[PDB]
Enzyme design. Sequence first.
Site, PDB file in Angstrom:
ATOM      1  N   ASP A 204      36.656  34.592  43.733  1.00  0.00           N
ATOM      2  CA  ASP A 204      37.990  34.028  43.492  1.00  0.00           C
ATOM      3  C   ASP A 204      38.435  32.778  44.174  1.00  0.00           C
ATOM      4  O   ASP A 204      38.983  31.868  43.545  1.00  0.00           O
ATOM      5  CB  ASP A 204      38.929  34.971  44.220  1.00  0.00           C
ATOM      6  CG  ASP A 204      40.013  35.504  43.337  1.00  0.00           C
ATOM      7  OD1 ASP A 204      40.312  34.856  42.301  1.00  0.00           O
ATOM      8  OD2 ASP A 204      40.547  36.599  43.683  1.00  0.00           O
TER       9      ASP A 204
ATOM     10  N   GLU B 117      32.678  43.596  46.608  1.00  0.00           N
ATOM     11  CA  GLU B 117      32.496  43.755  45.164  1.00  0.00           C
ATOM     12  C   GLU B 117      31.087  43.391  44.709  1.00  0.00           C
ATOM     13  O   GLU B 117      30.908  42.595  43.790  1.00  0.00           O
ATOM     14  CB  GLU B 117      33.560  43.024  44.337  1.00  0.00           C
ATOM     15  CG  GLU B 117      34.950  43.633  44.497  1.00  0.00           C
ATOM     16  CD  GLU B 117      36.053  42.866  43.791  1.00  0.00           C
ATOM     17  OE1 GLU B 117      35.758  41.821  43.194  1.00  0.00           O
ATOM     18  OE2 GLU B 117      37.217  43.306  43.836  1.00  0.00           O
TER      19      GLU B 117
ATOM     20  N   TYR C 257      42.395  47.866  40.032  1.00  0.00           N
ATOM     21  CA  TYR C 257      43.460  47.112  39.381  1.00  0.00           C
ATOM     22  C   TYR C 257      43.757  47.602  37.968  1.00  0.00           C
ATOM     23  O   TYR C 257      43.834  46.809  37.029  1.00  0.00           O
ATOM     24  CB  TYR C 257      42.996  45.654  39.346  1.00  0.00           C
ATOM     25  CG  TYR C 257      42.856  45.023  40.713  1.00  0.00           C
ATOM     26  CD1 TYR C 257      43.959  44.493  41.371  1.00  0.00           C
ATOM     27  CD2 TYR C 257      41.622  44.958  41.346  1.00  0.00           C
ATOM     28  CE1 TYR C 257      43.835  43.916  42.621  1.00  0.00           C
ATOM     29  CE2 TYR C 257      41.489  44.381  42.595  1.00  0.00           C
ATOM     30  CZ  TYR C 257      42.599  43.863  43.227  1.00  0.00           C
ATOM     31  OH  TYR C 257      42.471  43.288  44.471  1.00  0.00           O
TER      32      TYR C 257
ATOM     33  N   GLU D 282      41.747  46.886  48.006  1.00  0.00           N
ATOM     34  CA  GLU D 282      42.409  45.955  47.102  1.00  0.00           C
ATOM     35  C   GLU D 282      43.190  46.677  46.004  1.00  0.00           C
ATOM     36  O   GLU D 282      42.610  47.451  45.246  1.00  0.00           O
ATOM     37  CB  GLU D 282      41.391  45.008  46.448  1.00  0.00           C
ATOM     38  CG  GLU D 282      40.885  43.854  47.339  1.00  0.00           C
ATOM     39  CD  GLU D 282      40.020  42.839  46.583  1.00  0.00           C
ATOM     40  OE1 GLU D 282      40.083  42.807  45.339  1.00  0.00           O
ATOM     41  OE2 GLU D 282      39.279  42.065  47.228  1.00  0.00           O
TER      42      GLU D 282
END
Lengths: 588, 584
Positions: free
Chosen positions: A166, A409, A464, A500
């Site tokens: 990101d 990740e 998410y 997260e």
Amino acid sequence: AAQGSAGSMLKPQQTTTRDLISLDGLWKFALASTQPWTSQLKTSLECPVPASYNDIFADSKIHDHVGWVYYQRDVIVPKGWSEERYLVRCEAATHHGRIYVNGNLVADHVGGYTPFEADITDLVAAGEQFRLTIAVDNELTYQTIPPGKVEILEATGKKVQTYQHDFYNYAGLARSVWLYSVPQQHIQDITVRTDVQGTTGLIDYNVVASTTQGTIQVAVIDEDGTTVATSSGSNGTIHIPSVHLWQPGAAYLYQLHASIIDSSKKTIDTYKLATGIRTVKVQGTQFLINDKPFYFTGFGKHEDTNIRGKGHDDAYMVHDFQLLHWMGANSFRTSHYPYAEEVMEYADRQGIVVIDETPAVGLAFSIPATFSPDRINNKTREAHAQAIRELIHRDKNHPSVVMWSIANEPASNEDGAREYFAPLPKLARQLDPTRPVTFANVGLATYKADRIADLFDVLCLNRYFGWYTQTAELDEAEAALEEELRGWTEKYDKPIVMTEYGADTVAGLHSVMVTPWSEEFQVEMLDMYHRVFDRFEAMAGEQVWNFADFQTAVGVSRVDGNKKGVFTRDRKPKAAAHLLRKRWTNLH
Amino acid sequence: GSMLKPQQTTTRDLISLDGLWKFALASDDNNTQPWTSQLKTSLECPVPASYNDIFADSKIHDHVGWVYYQRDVIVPKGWSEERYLVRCEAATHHGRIYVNGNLVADHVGGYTPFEADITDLVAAGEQFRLTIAVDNELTYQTIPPGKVEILEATGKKVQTYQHDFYNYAGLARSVWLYSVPQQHIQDITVRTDVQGTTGLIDYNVVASTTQGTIQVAVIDEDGTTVATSSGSNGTIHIPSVHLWQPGAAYLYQLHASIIDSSKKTIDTYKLATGIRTVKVQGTQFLINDKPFYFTGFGKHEDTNIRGKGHDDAYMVHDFQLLHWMGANSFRTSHYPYAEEVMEYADRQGIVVIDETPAVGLAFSPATFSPDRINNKTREAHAQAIRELIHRDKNHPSVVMWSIANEPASNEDGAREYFAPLPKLARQLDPTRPVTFANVGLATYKADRIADLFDVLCLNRYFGWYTQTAELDEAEAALEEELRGWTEKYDKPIVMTEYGADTVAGLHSVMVTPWSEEFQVEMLDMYHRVFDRFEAMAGEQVWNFADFQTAVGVSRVDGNKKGVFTRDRKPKAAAHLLRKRWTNL
């Protein structure tokens, strides 16, 4: 820089015996074009040191640059230095740093987040002036430890840096540069392992001296200033009667004074190194700091502010920490790289718990099989481990640091992933047996699909649903999330932490209706997640993603970076801030 | 009571003291003398910064009075036989240095250096506790003036003042420990003249003692020395000199060394100079004998968390933004900025109007009297001129001194007050013209100070205050004033400030204030009028960026008249400006 090992010294400090000088300031700066380190520099271009260069200049070419850049400035060794051994250190280079004294290469270092230094004592003389030029390359590859590939643009031919993370690929001297001195016979490393017998606090130490001259004294002082135990030898343990324990909301730090006495009762080297005394155990589904169970609250964070980008900043650090206390956060995670060392010491004084993470982010391709002889191979694992070493070597001592995070990740659901990862947590437990080990798991790698998790002590999940899977369907998302929580709690007897969870929010975008990117939506997702955690007794903590909006690689679904911030990039509280403050301060 | 900016040479050493200091503010404890003990605080405040916004704590931000910064310092073992001292680049207004409980300096300027020779107080190789007390209180006699008051019901202390920007306090600029030889250089002075193609300079060094001799080399940008001289001062010609030009910085380096009986160097200093002249003739401002036009901004030392605190990156970026938009100048709004900025401007070819910290000499009660601003105030005002000019005299970038911003130059007493001041300036530095920035009320009729100044600096905001949203009307009231001044005085006129507030993102196609569009239109229409007046010498928009101010129902979290945002993003006007300033 050798395979299977780590050669940094202790964090340079000033003493009765060592001297310290800051090289920070503006430096002449230029871009790779040939062999610029052999003559002076030809630019009106000056770049501040503690800083990433990309944003600094308002220049597109500079921001976009792929390759090497050159920092330069003159340095003078103080004439007081001879009879003292002296050297030049970089707290961090962007990614790939090189140090030239006058136009001889003196150091070459591949980590992007850990120190490196060169002993220059036989190379310049006390009183002499040389031309310090430092080269920083920002190029990522499949073997570099945040992985990537440079490509070329078919039409214009422009060089372009791909990567899987990101956050933007900020390059340069992000962290302070130093010129310091040390006596010929000096302390190079110290290892502290704090434990507790009943109410008696014992710390096993280990001091490494350049030579075998004299002996090793150690005074151990309290916060008031009165020494409370002493010891001799390169190693032993120290007993502390009725210890004041370093506690996760209540930092106590003793000051371990390691000294190198010579033949006679005289001090020839000395070093002040703070420790606090705390144990960390995982029993089953439970995280114990000092034998009492603990629940994380806080954020994964970034080193990212307005113009300096990644460059460490004193005042944002202190402000950032005050915001944590303001809202009753107890921890955070060094997101996708080790942060400046000074942040760790601050965290110690501040009584904040840290999850310390290596710069292994984006070990996957699904944001093509990622574990092979093309993408992430054995030379990559080698660098991954190379980075685990330097992190631990550097951070082993901080009572705030409480667990190592091997990677962010990674593609841990894929064939190849297990072979790859197997030696890594094992390395960590070996180099440092005091802390537990983890990595932050991606959504794809479900409890079923993940083939890595069993090798780790704590389970860290990034999820998410209310964002990716059930877009704005908070109820259908509450389904998905508890589906998943069940799966993990059933399959494993570790404790779990949400490292997260979040949703992009634009400050001031409001809606009485369910609408992503609205301050309101952020609140709602965060809130329903919390409700779910509380119904699982296996949860050991929660870290919102993220602390504050931050800059990322250019992208259509990235509104000038990542807005999953609870605070703006200028550190202003969105609605979520106040929800988190309300939850974290009003209950346990 | 200052000295040249400390620098590391072959004979001078230099340590930075920046970093986290234990910070605590004065309460009314038993502990009335905090400087002689360890502080009770567990707060660390970063140094280069200023403290108000740092702690996310109201009591801290709101505090009226003293605070204390404290830390331990180690004087190096090798320092002995050498002379060392502790310098403060700046405090908030009132700073006191304490060295091991001992009061070692006390300084009343808010934005200039102060220091203390401590060679006999601490033993070289030994450690000491350094604690610095900074008081933020303004009075009718502090240089920005103001009074402290008590909130009737609650009892809370409050600080009133007359100027726009917020009263950020603290150690806003670096702190140093540094070495200097027993027989050191203390001050240097350089005055550059142009004599056809040849550049001449008159150096004047002041060393501690008079033994040995003074020697001077002048090296060009390429490493090759280009004129030499001997003596505590003399005058140097430079054949076919490379001139420092507003477009194209050029900086010779002046090495001044203190030779001794033998052929050895006991002390030495590197001092950059650019060769350039400033003359005002008629209505014209000539830099190296060609007409010049200030483009640029009044600025502010203001960023996000560090407040007024010096910042290398925002510095470099800021200038890069002047270059981006074709700006060539700026004004050190309402205080001298940090020393290194002036140095940087030199390297950058950016022209500077150096202003003292004297704003808010205005109570719109009668402002010039034995109550508000008296002789005592005027003493302090002359002191700041002394310290400003003493520090900055050398900079090729500095091109004019600005005595004060927006004083009541139209009230009685105004004239008796200011009279001595520009005389003082021209006496301290003949090489530069002198000015002050004129307020709106002080019209070309009403003002009674202006004749005493070399250049006319004004800051009209009609389209904002007067013909609020009536630009056609404002155009007229604007040209009316410019006829007035150009008709009355034979001097150059520079719009020191001008422009309207604007919220980034706020947009409109019609005449609506606080929209990005309205700002472009005001700025523009002003330029139309400036281009019609032949007496004009420059334009500086009122503001580089948004900055925090005293809390107000009319101030949206500070001043938003900035052409960029506080985090430095271009508003519509930034582009208007870039277009005008690069292209003609």
